[PDB]
Amino acid sequence: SMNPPPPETSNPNKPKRQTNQLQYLLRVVLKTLWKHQFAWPFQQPVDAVKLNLPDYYKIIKTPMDMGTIKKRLENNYYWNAQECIQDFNTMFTNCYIYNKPGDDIVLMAEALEKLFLQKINELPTEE
């Protein structure tokens, strides 16, 4: 089984803007999650070939990872902070769907999600 192409991280036809919330998502939320000791499996797309998971992309149809989210933020791909937050949620949800409760990767995702939610709770009001 082949890996799909990674999610799109740039599109020159999409409009671009800077907002304080998007800045916070990059400078605070992503920065904090990236350095967490359990972040490493979430820092790039799931390579189902190398991990030998032939059913991964049969089960997960909307893949997402923090490497892709990082690239989207740096490319000004997101217009709304909500789009970025949705991508984080998709990343966590995908992990919980593919894997089983109590699995190592699930416990790792749960730790990251807790931290994510703590940082999103301090998302500044739109300027």
Ligand X SMILES: COc1cc2c(cc1-c1c(C)noc1C)ncc1[nH]c(=O)n([C@H](C)c3ccccn3)c12
Contacting residues toward ligand X, per CB under 6 A: 41-42, 46, 51, 53, 95, 98-99, 104-105
Nearer to ligand X, 32 or 99 (CB): 99
Q: State in angstroms the smallest separation of the CB of 4 from ligand X.
A: 14
Nearer to ligand X, 29 or 112 (CB): 112
Q: State in angstroms the smallest separation of the CB of 33 from ligand X.
A: 13
- Cα–Cα distance, 72 to 89 (Å, whole number): 15
Residue 65 in contact with residue 45, Cβ under 8 Å?
yes
- Cα–Cα distance, 112 to 30 (Å, whole number): 11
Q: State in angstroms the smallest separation of the CB of 97 from ligand X.
A: 9
Q: State in angstroms the smallest separation of the CB of 9 from ligand X.
A: 18
Burial of 23 (0-12, 13-18, 19+ CB in 10 A): middle
Nearer to ligand X, 81 or 108 (CB): 108
- Cα–Cα distance, 8 to 74 (Å, whole number): 13
